[PDB]
Amino acid sequence: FYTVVGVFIVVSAMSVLFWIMAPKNNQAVWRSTVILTLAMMFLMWAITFLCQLHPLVAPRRSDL
Amino acid sequence: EEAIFRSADMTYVQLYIPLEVIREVTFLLGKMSVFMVMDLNKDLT
Amino acid sequence: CCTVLSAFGVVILSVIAHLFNTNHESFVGSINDPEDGPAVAHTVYLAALVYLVFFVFCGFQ
């Protein structure tokens, strides 16, 4: 689970570093598109990583 | 400013157009595209 | 519109023929899958060439 927190640190620090270094021309759509898309990419990565970190169902097939 | 997070700041100004320069001011405001008129005489038919 | 379908017929069937040639387990790895890899790759690569003929002929239209 700590390799989810370790990715949350480098995503959150990147989003904070982009909040202060956004271009001044279109600030409320530079720091709103890029910071929210990193959040949603990290959310789907964390959900697709934690479902396989400690699984309850093993993959079972016959034809191999 | 930009107005993509909230709306822009509106003012409700009041003009006074004389009858000598009336068509010219109206055709100027039609080309400037900044003044949203409001129907003052709603009670008239 | 045949040139778009023909360009995808080049790309997708070339990747499928390469994945049959290298015995990739998403195409050969099951019992219901075909047994010989390059035997299927030889008849998918010729279809890739056929769609390349369609792409070149409809590319001059």
Name the experiment that determined this structure: cryo-EM
Helices assigned H by DSSP within chain C: 2-21, 37-58
**Euclidean distance between CA atoms B1 and B9, whole angstroms:** 10
Q: Distance (Å) from the C-alpha of residue A41 to the closest C-alpha of chain B?
A: 23
**Euclidean distance between CA atoms C43 and C61, whole angstroms:** 28
Q: Distance (Å) from the C-alpha of residue A63 to the closest C-alpha of chain C?
A: 5
Domain boundaries, chain A: 1-64
**Euclidean distance between CA atoms C36 and C61, whole angstroms:** 39
**Euclidean distance between CA atoms B37 and C32, whole angstroms:** 73
**Euclidean distance between CA atoms C19 and B27, whole angstroms:** 69
For residue A24, which residues of chain B lie inside 8 Å, CB to CB? none
The pair phi, psi for residue B8, each rounded to 5°, is: -80, 165
Chains that touch B (3 or more CB pairs under 8 A): A
Element (H, E) at A27: helix A27-50
